[PDB]
Amino acid sequence: MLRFVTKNSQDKSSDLFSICSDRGTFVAHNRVRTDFKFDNLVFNRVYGVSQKFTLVGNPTVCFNEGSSYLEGIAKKYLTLDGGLAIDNVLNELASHAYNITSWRWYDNHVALLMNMLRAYHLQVLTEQGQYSAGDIPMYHDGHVKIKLPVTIDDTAGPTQFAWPSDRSTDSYPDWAQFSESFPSIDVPYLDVRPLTVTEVNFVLMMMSKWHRRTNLAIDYEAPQLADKFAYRHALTVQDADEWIEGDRTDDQFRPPSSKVMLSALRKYVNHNRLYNQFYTAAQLLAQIMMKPVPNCAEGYAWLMHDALVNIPKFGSIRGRYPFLLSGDAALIQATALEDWSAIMAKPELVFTYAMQVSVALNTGLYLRRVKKTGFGTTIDDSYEDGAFLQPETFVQAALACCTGQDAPLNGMSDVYVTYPDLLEFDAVTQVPITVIEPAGYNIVDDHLVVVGVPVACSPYMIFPVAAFDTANPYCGNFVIKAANKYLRKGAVYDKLEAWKLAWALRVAGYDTHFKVTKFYADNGDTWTHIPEFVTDGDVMEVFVTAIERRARHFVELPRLNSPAFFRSVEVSTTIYDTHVQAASRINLDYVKPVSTGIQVINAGELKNYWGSVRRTQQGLGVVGLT
Amino acid sequence: MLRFVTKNSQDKSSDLFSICSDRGTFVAHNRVRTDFKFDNLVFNRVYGVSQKFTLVGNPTVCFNEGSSYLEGIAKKYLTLDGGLAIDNVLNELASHAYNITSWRWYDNHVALLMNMLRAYHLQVLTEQGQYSAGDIPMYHDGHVKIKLPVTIDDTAGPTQFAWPSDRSTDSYPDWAQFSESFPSIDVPYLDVRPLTVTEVNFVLMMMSKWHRRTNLAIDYEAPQLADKFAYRHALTVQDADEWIEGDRTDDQFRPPSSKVMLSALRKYVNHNRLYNQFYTAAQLLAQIMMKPVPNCAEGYAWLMHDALVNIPKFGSIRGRYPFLLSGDAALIQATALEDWSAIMAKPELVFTYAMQVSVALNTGLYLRRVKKTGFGTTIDDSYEDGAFLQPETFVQAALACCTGQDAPLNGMSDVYVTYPDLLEFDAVTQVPITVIEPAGYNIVDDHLVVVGVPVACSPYMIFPVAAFDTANPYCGNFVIKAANKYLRKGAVYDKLEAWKLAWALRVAGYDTHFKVTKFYADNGDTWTHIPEFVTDGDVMEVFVTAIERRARHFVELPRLNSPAFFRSVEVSTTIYDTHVQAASRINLDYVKPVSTGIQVINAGELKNYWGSVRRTQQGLGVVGLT
């Protein structure tokens, strides 16, 4: 994910942002200058654009077991594939020799790593002093009032990060202390030797069942990862045990700080060599993290829609034997290693990547819906069902169709964040609406309806996004061309050319009408949504009438509508300064990972989904890392 | 004056209009189409313009004797010059031979002809049913209320044309009947043989003193033309005598109708061969007749200013001997003969020529004032005192400077209509003003002041007027050219180019601002007055800022102010239909005069002022007819 973020703008920028919330939402502000050069008369207008985001969500999570991955053990303990070298293990150690015939090796700690990630982010948020239940923004446009419900009330919601479980009200895993060389039960054991006492306590107690107490998307409900397990440690750690039996009071046993929690993460991962599984965990957390708050009224359907996540069941063989984590670690992906090094250099790469993936996902789904019609795209590709069926490649396909670069795959099989109710282009949403005054809006029975996925963000977190083959507002610059034909009342225009002209005029300060009435563009973002009527098929020409001016006008432009006054206006848009408000630039040359004691493979296996998906000219598809 | 009127537009048009009044004022409406061709995109806007006129005036008339003109007698009764051939007269017949040594021959009937002209026009006006005292229009512009006083109140003023004199309250001339061949007294006698009884009665009784009873300009006060005289007629006519001695009541002795009055005019003139004197009379009446009502507030100074007229004293030798009017009439100007034939073909040539001369006079005085500064004109000619000193060539010089064609001279020496208080460029006027709301206006002590002569009309009765050497709104068409230099806030412009641009934009529908604030142009005429500030010297460049639009907008035009959007707009204005409202086309081929029994000379004598004045390139001056 490091390559994706560092390639959205340029290899030199590498701009990162920290987590911030304000009752569950935050706003990312920008400052952008737009040019207008025509007849060697360069004009410009500098303005600020704001795209706010919300961390409130209610994703659905299913905990279903999957494949077993052993890409962290020594070379001699692995065969030519991911399967362990059982003969080597036994020629090293009996009853176990006969027992092994009945010991499946299901080692997959992705659920644990994701749990630690969300707990760390929650603790960072509460030490930042703004952790709360989280509430959706209340959007009101003079004509329509909307307010999506949330389960947990913010005011009564907790302000401090409590432990996910309860006071012994629910059962807890039967943990144990392990120091021998003989695994006694096929139940998984962990190896937490480098961890300190408090880190081990946090790990074991958070293994227990998690309860959802806030509307935060990373606060989803999760059951206990394993009913029984043991940890291979030098000493027994039992402070959390005193807490469950009802001895340690809340004040002395509180969730550990962010620094120690991140340290426990680091120790766990780089002692068990879980770089691949942690990369998968970070990918899933980034894809589940947050959604943008829509400026337009109909964009709230994106907020109401809930993702579906498939986290594999927890299993471990690392702690079963102590020599497995020794030796030379094998089959570690270079992308996973570099991503791990970067995220432990700065732990907010996940946050900035999550915001970028949210914006890219929304725009990719919407542009798939639009480019189905034939707007901007030459080839009538199978956008509907091509690479969006594969749940693991769903969000990556959306990112590829939006941005055009190689979206990083989950790196793990049978894990995905998927919107099942979004593959169809007929899917509707009933957003609650208390209409203030009647206007142009498809308001039927107190809820307007939307078709497919709407726009809820603006392509400003990722600006140079190459959505279309030709120049467009999504691209850096475009040239407004002559109309197809001019008439008395106006001129006809192609779908894309008309939208480009309307966008440029809205930035300049002109309101643009059309027939077969307004090009919508909300203030505070000044990005013109694609018109609903032109979105559908059978419409190839747009009649532009009445290019009127607005109350506030910035750049004064020719008519471009009358043949006499049309001029080849060439525009150009560049983003200058961004600052979230509820930098931190990274340096690749200082975060390079540890190549020693690690065997690194550049390529991956398509079964395990170690690759990327790129929007080819002939159609987007999955490709190998090679 | 026929050539002047028929050459203002074209030899084919020859458009004439009848007299009409509405409480002393009338309005002449037009319908004019203005073009706007640029980039091969011809645009046009059709609109109506109205220029109202007023017949109310109080001219000052001085009755001072002048030269004696004998250009109607037979050839044998004249010498090589205007002097009579006394030897021929005597070798034709004594005591008279000795008496003649004491008989000056002062024959000049111009006062009589002018009196009959004004009486005929008044009778036409009263039979039209709209004769009254006449009142000045009350102009009000939301900011300023003005109403010039008039001596005679309209409501109590007479509605029927009464006889100019009173009921024997004033003395009357001692008329007599003459039938012999011997003039008994050096007192003048008239020859009215072809006239009927009623025509003779009207002539003799109107010879008596005239009293001013209305505010009409042609109703000026005049004394009795001669204390004593006799008329050479077959029979004595004494009905007016019964009227003066108090016998004939008013009802039976009333002013004769228009037809019989015009018939008396015709008989008198073409029996006494007074074509030259009648041409002079018509010229003077046309120059005194009426003034335009000013659309702009400061233009009423033209209304307050009063002309000065020098009518020669009445004298006659035609009726002294009966053979003088016989023979071949000698020394008759072709222009006078053709003008006489035209005015007796239709008697409203005088009215249309008077309206045209009024508009041309106002515009000529104003353009002399403007072109003194250097606006539009290359040569700094002596506009102030060159040909405007000669009182007889004053109004003709104004017409020449305005229109550019040969203004017809008075054709008589020591006769003129002159504004003595107008030769100076510093002359001021105190127009009464009840100011409604304060605005841009030089209002000092209840009266704004004006400097020189203002614009009170628009060049629409005579449109193709060539005021300036270069193309201008006064000309048919002009091309708006590129600015001298363009700046951030606007562009600088020459005096004339800026005024042309402002006029074109006001016709199109754009309001034009400038600095070193508005280009004034009143509705109902949509002609833009020359700005006061640019009128004076030391100002050669005008800064044009803010070409804003108006409430009502007709032709949509490029900025012409910014270098990027400037386009070579070419305009064109043509007048289509005019109709006064309180045609009548003439046909030259049917009004050609009687060449038989008349000796016609094309040339004239500069002493007698038989010529014209043309605006030469090097300067306007009097030229001969040749």
Short mmCIF file of C-alpha atoms in Angstrom, two decimals, chain B residues 124-426:
data_model
loop_
_atom_site.label_atom_id
_atom_site.label_comp_id
_atom_site.label_asym_id
_atom_site.label_seq_id
_atom_site.Cartn_x
_atom_site.Cartn_y
_atom_site.Cartn_z
CA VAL B 124 -54.68 77.15 -40.65
CA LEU B 125 -53.94 76.36 -37.02
CA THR B 126 -57.33 77.60 -35.80
CA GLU B 127 -59.28 75.81 -38.55
CA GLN B 128 -57.33 72.71 -37.55
CA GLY B 129 -59.05 73.29 -34.21
CA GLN B 130 -55.94 73.42 -32.01
CA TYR B 131 -55.03 77.12 -32.01
CA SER B 132 -54.46 78.41 -28.48
CA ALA B 133 -52.16 80.62 -26.44
CA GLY B 134 -49.50 77.90 -26.45
CA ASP B 135 -47.67 76.61 -23.39
CA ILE B 136 -44.15 75.30 -22.87
CA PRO B 137 -43.84 71.61 -21.89
CA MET B 138 -43.30 70.78 -18.22
CA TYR B 139 -40.27 68.48 -18.05
CA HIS B 140 -39.59 66.38 -14.96
CA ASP B 141 -36.86 63.75 -14.59
CA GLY B 142 -37.41 62.36 -11.10
CA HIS B 143 -34.60 64.59 -9.83
CA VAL B 144 -35.48 68.03 -11.22
CA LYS B 145 -38.74 69.85 -11.98
CA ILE B 146 -38.73 72.74 -14.46
CA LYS B 147 -41.48 74.83 -16.03
CA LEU B 148 -40.61 77.94 -18.02
CA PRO B 149 -43.11 80.81 -17.64
CA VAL B 150 -45.18 82.12 -20.55
CA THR B 151 -46.89 85.51 -20.75
CA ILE B 152 -50.33 84.43 -22.00
CA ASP B 153 -52.19 81.75 -20.06
CA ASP B 154 -53.39 78.92 -22.29
CA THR B 155 -56.74 78.31 -20.58
CA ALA B 156 -57.93 81.93 -20.73
CA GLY B 157 -56.13 82.43 -24.04
CA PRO B 158 -58.25 82.75 -27.17
CA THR B 159 -59.18 79.62 -29.07
CA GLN B 160 -60.19 81.40 -32.29
CA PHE B 161 -57.92 83.59 -34.41
CA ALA B 162 -59.12 87.11 -33.69
CA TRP B 163 -58.03 90.00 -35.87
CA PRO B 164 -54.62 91.28 -34.70
CA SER B 165 -55.85 94.82 -34.01
CA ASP B 166 -58.56 95.95 -31.55
CA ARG B 167 -62.01 97.61 -31.82
CA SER B 168 -60.88 101.05 -33.03
CA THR B 169 -59.05 101.30 -29.70
CA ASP B 170 -55.86 101.95 -31.67
CA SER B 171 -55.48 104.15 -34.72
CA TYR B 172 -55.56 102.61 -38.20
CA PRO B 173 -53.85 103.55 -41.47
CA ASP B 174 -55.62 106.12 -43.62
CA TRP B 175 -56.18 104.00 -46.72
CA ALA B 176 -57.54 105.38 -49.98
CA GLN B 177 -58.76 104.28 -53.40
CA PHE B 178 -56.56 105.03 -56.41
CA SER B 179 -57.48 104.71 -60.09
CA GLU B 180 -55.71 107.58 -61.90
CA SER B 181 -52.22 107.64 -63.45
CA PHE B 182 -50.85 110.36 -61.15
CA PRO B 183 -49.32 109.59 -57.73
CA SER B 184 -50.44 112.46 -55.52
CA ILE B 185 -48.29 111.91 -52.41
CA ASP B 186 -44.91 110.27 -51.88
CA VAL B 187 -46.84 107.95 -49.55
CA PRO B 188 -46.72 104.37 -50.91
CA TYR B 189 -49.58 102.88 -52.88
CA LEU B 190 -50.28 99.23 -53.63
CA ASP B 191 -51.73 97.56 -56.71
CA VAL B 192 -54.31 94.93 -55.74
CA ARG B 193 -56.39 94.77 -58.93
CA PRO B 194 -56.53 90.95 -59.33
CA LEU B 195 -57.59 90.56 -55.68
CA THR B 196 -61.25 90.11 -54.80
CA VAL B 197 -63.12 92.29 -52.31
CA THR B 198 -62.54 90.11 -49.24
CA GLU B 199 -58.86 89.56 -50.04
CA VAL B 200 -58.34 93.32 -50.41
CA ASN B 201 -60.18 93.85 -47.11
CA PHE B 202 -57.95 91.36 -45.31
CA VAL B 203 -54.78 92.86 -46.80
CA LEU B 204 -55.64 96.45 -45.90
CA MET B 205 -56.94 95.72 -42.42
CA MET B 206 -53.98 93.48 -41.53
CA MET B 207 -51.70 96.31 -42.68
CA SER B 208 -52.93 97.96 -39.46
CA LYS B 209 -51.15 97.43 -36.16
CA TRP B 210 -50.71 93.84 -34.97
CA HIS B 211 -51.06 92.89 -31.30
CA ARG B 212 -49.46 89.85 -29.69
CA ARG B 213 -52.14 87.79 -27.95
CA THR B 214 -50.58 84.30 -27.74
CA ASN B 215 -47.22 82.84 -26.78
CA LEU B 216 -46.76 81.68 -30.39
CA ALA B 217 -43.48 82.73 -31.97
CA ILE B 218 -45.18 83.86 -35.20
CA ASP B 219 -47.57 85.98 -33.12
CA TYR B 220 -44.95 88.63 -32.37
CA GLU B 221 -46.00 92.25 -31.93
CA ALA B 222 -45.78 94.52 -34.98
CA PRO B 223 -46.89 98.13 -35.53
CA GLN B 224 -48.90 99.45 -38.46
CA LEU B 225 -46.83 99.13 -41.61
CA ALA B 226 -47.73 102.61 -42.89
CA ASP B 227 -49.76 105.47 -41.43
CA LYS B 228 -51.06 106.39 -44.91
CA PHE B 229 -51.38 104.53 -48.20
CA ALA B 230 -53.71 103.86 -51.12
CA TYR B 231 -54.57 100.76 -53.15
CA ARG B 232 -54.93 100.75 -56.94
CA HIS B 233 -58.18 98.82 -57.40
CA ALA B 234 -61.18 98.97 -59.71
CA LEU B 235 -63.56 99.66 -56.81
CA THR B 236 -63.49 100.98 -53.27
CA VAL B 237 -63.58 98.29 -50.58
CA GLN B 238 -64.93 99.54 -47.26
CA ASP B 239 -66.26 96.60 -45.22
CA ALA B 240 -63.23 96.76 -42.93
CA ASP B 241 -63.87 100.51 -42.86
CA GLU B 242 -67.36 99.81 -41.52
CA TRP B 243 -65.70 97.49 -39.00
CA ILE B 244 -63.32 100.19 -37.72
CA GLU B 245 -66.00 102.88 -37.52
CA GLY B 246 -67.96 100.34 -35.47
CA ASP B 247 -70.70 99.19 -37.84
CA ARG B 248 -69.99 95.63 -39.01
CA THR B 249 -70.30 93.25 -36.07
CA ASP B 250 -67.65 90.63 -35.37
CA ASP B 251 -69.65 87.66 -36.66
CA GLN B 252 -70.03 88.87 -40.25
CA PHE B 253 -66.53 90.38 -40.42
CA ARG B 254 -64.22 87.57 -39.28
CA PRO B 255 -60.71 86.69 -40.45
CA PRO B 256 -60.90 85.05 -43.88
CA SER B 257 -60.39 81.32 -44.25
CA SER B 258 -57.02 79.74 -44.96
CA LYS B 259 -57.79 79.10 -48.64
CA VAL B 260 -58.81 82.67 -49.46
CA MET B 261 -55.89 84.05 -47.42
CA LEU B 262 -53.44 81.91 -49.37
CA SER B 263 -55.18 82.97 -52.59
CA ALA B 264 -54.67 86.63 -51.63
CA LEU B 265 -51.00 85.83 -50.99
CA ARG B 266 -50.69 84.18 -54.40
CA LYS B 267 -52.45 86.99 -56.27
CA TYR B 268 -50.43 89.71 -54.54
CA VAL B 269 -47.08 88.04 -55.16
CA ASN B 270 -47.54 86.90 -58.74
CA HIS B 271 -49.13 90.16 -59.85
CA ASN B 272 -46.48 92.38 -58.25
CA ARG B 273 -43.73 89.88 -59.15
CA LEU B 274 -42.51 89.83 -55.53
CA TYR B 275 -40.83 86.43 -55.80
CA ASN B 276 -37.54 87.61 -54.26
CA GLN B 277 -39.19 89.53 -51.42
CA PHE B 278 -41.52 86.61 -50.70
CA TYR B 279 -38.55 84.23 -50.66
CA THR B 280 -36.94 86.48 -48.05
CA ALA B 281 -40.21 86.56 -46.09
CA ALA B 282 -40.46 82.76 -46.10
CA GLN B 283 -36.82 82.48 -45.03
CA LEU B 284 -37.38 84.81 -42.08
CA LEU B 285 -40.61 83.06 -41.04
CA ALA B 286 -38.92 79.66 -41.23
CA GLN B 287 -36.00 80.85 -39.11
CA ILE B 288 -38.32 82.38 -36.49
CA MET B 289 -40.98 79.63 -36.46
CA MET B 290 -40.13 77.04 -33.80
CA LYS B 291 -37.54 75.41 -31.52
CA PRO B 292 -37.13 71.81 -30.34
CA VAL B 293 -38.14 70.71 -26.87
CA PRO B 294 -34.96 69.45 -25.13
CA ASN B 295 -34.97 65.93 -23.72
CA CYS B 296 -32.05 66.73 -21.41
CA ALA B 297 -32.52 69.00 -18.41
CA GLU B 298 -29.84 71.58 -19.21
CA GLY B 299 -31.05 72.00 -22.79
CA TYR B 300 -33.85 74.38 -21.82
CA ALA B 301 -31.46 77.33 -22.01
CA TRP B 302 -32.05 77.15 -25.75
CA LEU B 303 -35.75 77.64 -25.01
CA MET B 304 -35.14 80.63 -22.74
CA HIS B 305 -32.94 82.40 -25.31
CA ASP B 306 -34.79 84.78 -27.64
CA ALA B 307 -33.88 85.59 -31.23
CA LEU B 308 -33.52 89.08 -32.69
CA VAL B 309 -35.17 89.83 -36.04
CA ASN B 310 -34.60 92.86 -38.29
CA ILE B 311 -37.59 93.30 -40.61
CA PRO B 312 -37.27 96.22 -43.06
CA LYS B 313 -39.80 99.02 -43.05
CA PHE B 314 -42.69 98.72 -45.47
CA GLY B 315 -42.56 100.68 -48.71
CA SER B 316 -44.17 100.44 -52.11
CA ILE B 317 -43.88 101.85 -55.61
CA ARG B 318 -45.72 99.04 -57.43
CA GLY B 319 -49.11 100.72 -57.06
CA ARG B 320 -47.80 104.18 -57.94
CA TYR B 321 -47.99 103.56 -61.70
CA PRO B 322 -50.04 100.86 -63.47
CA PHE B 323 -47.57 100.05 -66.27
CA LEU B 324 -44.73 99.03 -63.93
CA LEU B 325 -46.14 95.54 -63.33
CA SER B 326 -46.60 95.10 -67.10
CA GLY B 327 -43.93 94.06 -69.55
CA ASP B 328 -41.26 91.45 -68.87
CA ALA B 329 -40.42 91.03 -65.19
CA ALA B 330 -36.69 91.46 -64.65
CA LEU B 331 -34.01 90.13 -62.31
CA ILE B 332 -35.86 87.23 -60.68
CA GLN B 333 -33.69 84.63 -58.99
CA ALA B 334 -34.23 81.07 -60.18
CA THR B 335 -34.02 79.79 -56.60
CA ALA B 336 -36.65 82.30 -55.50
CA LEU B 337 -38.94 81.39 -58.40
CA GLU B 338 -38.69 77.64 -57.78
CA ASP B 339 -39.17 78.11 -54.03
CA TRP B 340 -42.27 80.22 -54.71
CA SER B 341 -43.69 77.63 -57.10
CA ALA B 342 -43.08 74.89 -54.54
CA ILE B 343 -44.60 76.74 -51.59
CA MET B 344 -47.72 77.63 -53.56
CA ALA B 345 -47.93 74.03 -54.76
CA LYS B 346 -47.90 72.99 -51.09
CA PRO B 347 -47.84 75.67 -48.37
CA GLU B 348 -46.21 73.44 -45.76
CA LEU B 349 -42.75 73.46 -47.31
CA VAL B 350 -42.22 76.46 -45.03
CA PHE B 351 -43.20 74.38 -41.99
CA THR B 352 -40.97 71.41 -42.79
CA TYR B 353 -38.09 73.73 -43.69
CA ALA B 354 -38.64 75.61 -40.42
CA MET B 355 -38.45 72.41 -38.36
CA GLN B 356 -35.34 71.32 -40.26
CA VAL B 357 -33.71 74.73 -39.83
CA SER B 358 -34.49 74.70 -36.11
CA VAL B 359 -32.84 71.31 -35.59
CA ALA B 360 -29.91 72.25 -37.83
CA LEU B 361 -29.45 75.60 -36.06
CA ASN B 362 -29.30 74.07 -32.60
CA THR B 363 -26.93 71.32 -33.71
CA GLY B 364 -24.76 73.78 -35.65
CA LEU B 365 -24.33 76.12 -32.71
CA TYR B 366 -23.53 73.21 -30.40
CA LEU B 367 -21.07 71.64 -32.84
CA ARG B 368 -19.37 75.01 -33.32
CA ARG B 369 -18.94 75.17 -29.54
CA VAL B 370 -17.64 71.59 -29.43
CA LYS B 371 -15.36 71.84 -32.48
CA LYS B 372 -13.80 74.97 -31.00
CA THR B 373 -12.15 72.65 -28.49
CA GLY B 374 -10.74 70.33 -31.14
CA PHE B 375 -13.16 67.44 -30.81
CA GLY B 376 -13.37 65.64 -34.14
CA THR B 377 -12.00 68.54 -36.18
CA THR B 378 -8.39 68.79 -37.34
CA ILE B 379 -8.06 72.52 -38.07
CA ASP B 380 -8.47 75.06 -35.27
CA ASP B 381 -10.58 77.36 -37.42
CA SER B 382 -12.08 80.65 -36.21
CA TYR B 383 -15.41 79.08 -35.31
CA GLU B 384 -16.03 81.78 -32.70
CA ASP B 385 -16.10 84.89 -34.89
CA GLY B 386 -15.54 83.90 -38.52
CA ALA B 387 -18.91 83.98 -40.30
CA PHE B 388 -21.13 84.25 -37.22
CA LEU B 389 -20.49 88.00 -36.88
CA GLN B 390 -22.45 88.85 -40.03
CA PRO B 391 -25.99 88.80 -38.61
CA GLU B 392 -27.50 87.98 -42.00
CA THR B 393 -25.18 84.96 -42.33
CA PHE B 394 -25.47 83.86 -38.68
CA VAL B 395 -28.11 81.13 -38.98
CA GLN B 396 -26.80 80.12 -42.40
CA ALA B 397 -23.32 79.72 -40.93
CA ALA B 398 -24.76 77.56 -38.15
CA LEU B 399 -26.56 75.40 -40.71
CA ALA B 400 -23.41 75.07 -42.82
CA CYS B 401 -21.28 74.08 -39.83
CA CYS B 402 -23.90 71.51 -38.82
CA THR B 403 -25.01 69.82 -42.03
CA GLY B 404 -22.21 70.55 -44.50
CA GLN B 405 -24.34 71.58 -47.48
CA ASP B 406 -24.93 75.09 -48.82
CA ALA B 407 -27.27 76.93 -46.46
CA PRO B 408 -29.52 79.30 -48.45
CA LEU B 409 -28.90 82.96 -47.68
CA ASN B 410 -31.60 85.49 -46.80
CA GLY B 411 -31.45 87.00 -50.30
CA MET B 412 -31.86 90.49 -48.84
CA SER B 413 -29.52 92.94 -47.16
CA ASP B 414 -29.89 94.13 -43.55
CA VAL B 415 -32.36 91.38 -42.63
CA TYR B 416 -31.47 88.67 -40.16
CA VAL B 417 -32.46 86.42 -37.30
CA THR B 418 -29.58 86.72 -34.85
CA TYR B 419 -28.86 85.66 -31.27
CA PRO B 420 -26.51 88.42 -30.02
CA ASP B 421 -26.02 86.79 -26.61
CA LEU B 422 -24.80 83.54 -28.19
CA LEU B 423 -21.59 84.49 -30.02
CA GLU B 424 -19.62 84.20 -26.79
CA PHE B 425 -18.76 80.73 -25.52
CA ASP B 426 -19.03 81.92 -21.90
#
